[PDB]
Amino acid sequence: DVSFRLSGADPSSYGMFIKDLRNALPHTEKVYNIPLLLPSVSGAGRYLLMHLFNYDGNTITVAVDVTNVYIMGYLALTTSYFFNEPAADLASQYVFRSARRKITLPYSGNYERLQIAAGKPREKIPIGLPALDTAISTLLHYDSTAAAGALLVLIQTTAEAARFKYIEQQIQERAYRDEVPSSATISLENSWSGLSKQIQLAQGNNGVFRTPTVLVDSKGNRVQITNVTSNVVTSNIQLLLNTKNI
């Protein structure tokens, strides 16, 4: 398991949590020095438990699929909550079984569906450590519309930060003041599968992408990523989605 406490949190403690999260994901090899997530894990070992504590010390446990860093569901007191999707239903066979009741959320976990449920795109939803405190608090008691927004915050401040050093740093800058994600942040989130694929394909193609990946940079300008020498590959991305799962 991994844990993060918002009470007393600062950029350093958040950084330690994201390091722990990354290190909790298993891999047998690295591709261009980046951990390659496994094609498959069997049984309960497929799921990592994240214990998150709001400023008041109340807690939820979030279940994360270790092959893709997808959030499956979470436990709040004696109630479990899972996304309305087959992968999450499968997860419910293994985690939070001791919960008194299980609620299936009225949406799947993908960004497009969560934004519809929340009533806004995540371009307009502030993120940061304060927002994460709010998200945890919202998830403690069921409210599906509120939870969609909370989950958009949760996914970005945990999973996406684990995937990209740039996103981790963006949240560290928002340790005491929320701000909507940069255009680059959104770009990286949307390109993780594509980037993971091209980096794996680059092995066997002299480090060259079979298909270029278009990203927005820290400046708001649209760059094109063609090979493993790019900063996105050498410094930014921290985990690769296995091509088996793409």
- Bridge-based pairing of strands 101-104 and 79-82 is parallel
CB of 165 to ligand NAG, least distance (A): 17
Is 160 among the annotated ligand-binding positions?
Answer: yes
Asked if residue 227 binds ligand NAG (CB under 6 A), the reply is: yes
CB of 229 to ligand NAG, least distance (A): 5
Gap between the Cα atoms of 62 and 59, Å rounded: 10
Gap between the Cα atoms of 237 and 156, Å rounded: 14
Only one of the segments 50-58, 104-112, 132-140, 196-204 lies at the binding site for ligand CTN (rule: CB under 6 A); that segment is 104-112
Query: 149 touches which of ligand NAG, ligand CTN, none (CB within 5 to 8 A by kind)?
Result: none
Q: DSSP class of residue 156?
A: I
Q: Which is nearer to ligand NAG, 134 or 230 (CB)?
A: 230
Query: Could you give the 3-state DSSP secondary structure of residue 94?
Result: coil
Query: 34 touches which of ligand NAG, ligand CTN, none (CB within 5 to 8 A by kind)?
Result: none
From candidates 131, 150, 159, 171, binder to ligand CTN by CB under 6 A? 159
Closest CA to 198 of 169, 233, 149: 233
Ranges within 176-235 binding ligand CTN (CB under 6 A): 192
CB of 70 to ligand CTN, least distance (A): 4
- With the C-alpha atoms ordered 108, 111, 112, 114, is the resulting torsion angle positive or negative? positive
Only one of the segments 54-62, 67-75, 99-107, 141-149 lies at the binding site for ligand CTN (rule: CB under 6 A); that segment is 67-75
From candidates 4, 83, 107, 209, binder to ligand CTN by CB under 6 A? 83
- Helical ranges in 81-235 per DSSP H: 86-91, 111-118, 129-139, 144-155, 161-163, 165-173, 183-202, 231
Which residues face 219 on adjacent strands? none
Is 47 among the annotated ligand-binding positions?
Answer: no
Q: DSSP class of residue 133?
A: H
Closest CA to 182 of 158, 206, 156, 204: 156
Query: Could you give the 3-state DSSP secondary structure of residue 184?
Result: helix
The residues annotated with a catalytic role in the active site are: 160
Asked if residue 205 binds ligand NAG (CB under 6 A), the reply is: no
Torsion angles phi and psi, residue 3, rounded to 5: -135, 150
Only one of the segments 25-33, 50-58, 80-88, 123-131 lies at the binding site for ligand CTN (rule: CB under 6 A); that segment is 80-88
Query: 226 touches which of ligand NAG, ligand CTN, none (CB within 5 to 8 A by kind)?
Result: ligand NAG
Q: Which residues bind to ligand CTN, rule: CB under 6 A?
A: 70-72, 83, 85, 88, 109-111, 155, 159, 192
